């Protein structure tokens, strides 16, 4: 894994001592070469995981998320011009190097053997995102958004460290195998309940669930496209990854104590899918969509079925791709018209004839189109939760109906019916935006052909 750590370091002074109007080509080319080399990882077989040290090791949960990170880097590094192409050379290099450093800590975090190391690189992922969204937020409440982001994610995430130190000095080391192969049941006392609530509540903050979800939408509508897509896809699916790893301990008490979180997640999934049906501010619909789908992920993690974990990791990867792409189309329409609203930018079937295909195809991958990976994830979560109880499938299908409703309303609102005929500034679609759309969609369809990769540990 060091063969993936060290060229991420070496790609950073590349950006500094490449000359003017040549940093772009070198960084894009070399990060795509890193993406091929990342795809060469996929070796993981059968019985064990694979160990790239006593420091690095990869479960089959971590492999598609790692390839997702090293694939979402060059897509973003191309995605983030035309709103900073007029800015300075030094600030431009600082932004690109900040994204490279954020990739580095994400690789650190996904191949974290030890949970202490996982926590350190977790909040190391947390650090540069505040700087990115605050320095290039392009709105007036970016301070409020970054500050809520910071204090929510710390003040939830912080006693997790105390619980991990306690496990460190009551059971020896914190390799995942020796945390495994040794883990003993922890009975229904109260201190065990608070340890569970500390760990699970830190990751509850990170996902988010419904009582803690206003964390998210300000940090997406008041942020640039790079921070938005990395924030949503890699940070929320990293939180889910972390909960998947740490839930191997605390086996008996989750049945006793894990009912109200299931409850808040289900009813807030319904209320969040309802709130993203009537809003303006086009960017925010995808944010509350992400809240709904990760509440579904949380229900899937806290019930403890192998069907549930396969559906959980499939839903994670598919929704990461879909929500990142749909953020990128929203930024494309915002670069067309400086609005951020929804009822203004109408028309766009007549004009921009090719963009309709990407809007429709992204809205259908959000619709749970049936050969796609999104429906595979949602379907296995529905199967596992109907095994959990015979009555909760009503909420799942009602989420399904409202999800199709708001997604297809988001389609037929902005891009259906009549241009407002006072706009007269929109240019035909560049090759860059459609290259980004083709870099989003085509891996999702090619995984829809062969999804034996993205199903996780319990394949």
């Amino acid at each position: 894994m060091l063969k993936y750590i060290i060229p991420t370091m070496m790609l950073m002074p590349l950006t500094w001592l490449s000359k003017n109007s040549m940093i772009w080509i070198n960084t894009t080319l070399h990060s795509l070469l890193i993406s091929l080399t990342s795809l060469l990882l996929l070796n993981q077989f059968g019985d064990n995981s694979l160990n790239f040290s006593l420091t690095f090791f990869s479960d089959s949960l971590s492999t598609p998320l790692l390839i997702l990170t090293m694939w979402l880097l060059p897509l973003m590094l191309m995605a983030s011009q035309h709103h900073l192409s007029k800015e300075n050379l030094a600030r431009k290099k600082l932004f690109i190097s900040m994204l490279i450093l954020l990739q580095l800590f994400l690789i650190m975090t996904f191949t974290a053997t030890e949970l202490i190391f996982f926590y350190i690189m977790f909040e190391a992922t947390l650090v540069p995102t505040l700087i990115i969204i605050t320095r290039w937020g392009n709105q007036t409440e970016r301070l409020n958004a970054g500050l809520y982001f910071l204090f929510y994610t710390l003040a939830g995430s912080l006693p997790l460290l105390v619980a991990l130190i306690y496990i460190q000095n009551t059971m020896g080391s914190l390799n995942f195998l020796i945390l495994q192969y040794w883990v003993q049941p922890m009975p229904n006392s109260w201190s065990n309940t608070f340890m569970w609530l500390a760990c699970m509540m830190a990751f509850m903050v990170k996902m988010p669930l419904y009582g803690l979800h206003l964390w998210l939408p300000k940090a997406h509508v008041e942020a640039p496209i790079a921070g938005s897509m990395v924030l949503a896809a890699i940070l929320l699916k990293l939180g889910g990854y972390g909960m998947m790893r740490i839930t191997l301990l605390l086996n008996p008490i989750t049945d006793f104590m894990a009912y109200p979180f299931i409850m808040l997640s289900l009813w807030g999934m319904i209320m969040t899918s309802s709130i993203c049906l009537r809003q303006t501010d086009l960017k925010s619909l995808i944010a509350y969509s992400s809240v709904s789908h990760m509440a579904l992920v949380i229900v899937a993690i806290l019930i403890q079925t192998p069907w549930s974990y396969m559906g959980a990791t499939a839903l994670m990867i598919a929704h990461g791709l879909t929500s990142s792409m749909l953020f990128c189309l929203a930024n494309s329409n915002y670069e067309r018209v400086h609005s951020r609203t929804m009822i203004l930018a109408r028309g766009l079937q007549t004009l921009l004839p090719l963009m309709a295909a990407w809007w429709l195809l992204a809205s259908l991958t959000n619709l749970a189109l049936p050969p796609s990976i999104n429906l595979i994830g949602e379907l296995f979560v529905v199967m596992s939760t109907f095994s959990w109880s015979n009555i909760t499938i009503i909420l799942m299908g009602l989420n399904m109906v409202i999800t199709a409703l708001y997604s297809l309303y988001m389609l037929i609102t902005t891009q259906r019916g009549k241009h407002t005929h006072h706009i007269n500034n929109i240019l035909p679609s560049f090759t860059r935006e459609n290259a980004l759309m083709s870099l989003h969609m085509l891996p999702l369809l090619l995984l829809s052909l062969n999804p034996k990769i993205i199903l996780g540990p319990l394949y």
Binding site: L54, T55, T113, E114, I116, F117, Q168, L174
Partner: protein, 57 residues
């Protein structure tokens, strides 16, 4: 007779033979409780470096 002692001959620390024996433990106290076991010998390089969270060797 009785020659006067010169200045300063009422000095000059003096021997005398006795009959009673010289005493052990004139401070009527108990024995000494415990010595401390002294750590000696050569030392090996440490077992796996630090044995902290990580930073192995």
């Amino acid at each position: 007779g009785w020659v006067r002692p010169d200045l300063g001959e009422l000095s000059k620390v003096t021997k005398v033979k006795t009959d009673r024996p010289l005493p052990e433990n004139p401070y009527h106290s108990r024995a000494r409780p415990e010595p401390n076991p002294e750590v000696e010998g050569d030392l090996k390089p440490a077992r796996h470096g630090s044995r902290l969270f990580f930073w192995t060797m």
